Write a protein that binds this ligand. Structure first.
Ligand SMILES: [Ca+2]
Length: 375
């Protein structure tokens, strides 16, 4: 089998260029209204294929800028907007989660919500086609639906752990005596909202005979049933740029990496393939604090810290053992530099972080976290 790197190259080779298309796709936007300007342009094009041309984007009439950097910036600003829960299209999968899911109440926030989902689909397709990344992380089920893969009880763990354990227990035990019904009780606005999992579900008891169906219907209610049209609109837009047969060479994990460049960064590997400069050591107090910090950071921050130091968000296949600097092989490096007053700096060409010898872990947390926020 092919690994991700080979899958991607294979993927790019099959993604043929369009010839019956204008040499470039011109869209001039205003920062204050990026979302509405992009939507109107990207949803108005004669053919979706026009979005495959080289991106010619102009912000606020600003002439003379490198079109390649402007595009990359656009993908960033537009992501910020599309995925903002303020718009009612997407929403955090949970209060303690940073991941996104389709808001089942999309239509209530926006009557024309379906075309906006097709738009977000087109933009997502544009990022992948042009080898750029979107800014946003979706729940695993979002990626599975794209690949037409089954949503499983396990996908629930990563989202709602309490819901996962209740269903796991039901799977592993005879639930009959609990007298459960084919219904889901959702607590909203200080009230309990009961929903039939099926017709007459309130009078149907969950037993060993129908519990697999029960679990399935619960998973569908949580991830699929109420967002069928939203996701359908999104997929239609996406597949106007990327044929779905092609995207199917990847799995949910690879797809996530391909689109948003996100993934679980093995801190252990990182830790073990890091070098220390100017008095620093693996046992050195400050270093211990640095790794403690990284360990408690969000997947998003671990990645952006990596970006800050490396100059990229990418983690080399085969781990950090094969991390490359600017002039060849260069392990992630941390060097003692400066006084506790100044923030850490990053020499990307050497994949090195200059870290002052802080006197408190919490101080180190602050300083480091701030230096990452500018990146
Ligand atoms: Ca060491």
């Amino acid at each position: 089998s092919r690994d991700y790197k080979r899958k991607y190259e294979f993927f790019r080779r099959k993604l043929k260029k369009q010839n019956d298309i204008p040499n470039k796709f011109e869209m001039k936007l205003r920062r204050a209204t990026v979302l509405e300007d992009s939507y109107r342009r990207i949803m108005g094009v004669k053919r979706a294929d026009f979005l495959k041309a080289r991106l010619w984007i102009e912000f606020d009439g600003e002439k003379g800028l490198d079109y390649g950097g402007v595009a990359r910036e656009w993908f960033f600003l537009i992501s910020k907007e599309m995925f903002n829960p303020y718009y009612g299209l997407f929403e955090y999968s949970a209060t303690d989660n940073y991941t996104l899911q389709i808001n089942p109440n999309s239509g209530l926030c926006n009557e024309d919500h379906l075309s906006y989902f097709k738009f977000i689909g087109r933009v997502a397709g544009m990022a992948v086609y042009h080898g750029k990344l979107l800014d946003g992380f979706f729940i695993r089920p979002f990626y599975k639906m794209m690949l037409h893969k089954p949503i499983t009880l396990h996908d629930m763990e990563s989202v709602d752990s309490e819901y996962y354990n209740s269903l796991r227990w039901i799977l592993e035990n005879d639930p009959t005596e609990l007298d459960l019904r084919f219904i889901i009780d959702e607590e909203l606005f200080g009230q309990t909202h009961q929903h039939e999992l099926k017709n007459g579900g309130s009078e149907i008891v969950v037993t060993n005979k129908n519990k697999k169906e029960y679990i399935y219907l619960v998973i569908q209610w949580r991830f699929v049933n109420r967002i069928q049209k939203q996701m359908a609109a999104f997929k239609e837009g996406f597949f106007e740029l990327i044929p779905q047969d092609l995207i199917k060479i990847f799995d949910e994990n690879e797809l996530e990496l391909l689109m948003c460049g996100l993934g679980d960064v093995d801190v252990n590997d990182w830790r073990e393939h890091t070098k220390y400069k100017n008095g620093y050591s693996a046992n050195h107090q400050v270093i211990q604090w640095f790794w403690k910090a990284v360990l408690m950071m969000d997947s998003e921050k671990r990645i952006r810290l990596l970006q800050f130091v490396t100059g990229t968000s990418r983690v080399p296949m085969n781990g950090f053992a094969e991390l490359y600097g600017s002039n060849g092989p260069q392990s992630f490096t941390v060097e003692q530099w400066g006084t506790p007053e100044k923030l850490p700096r990053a020499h990307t060409c050497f994949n090195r972080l200059d870290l002052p010898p802080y006197e408190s872990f919490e101080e180190l947390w602050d300083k480091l976290q701030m230096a990452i926020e500018n990146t």
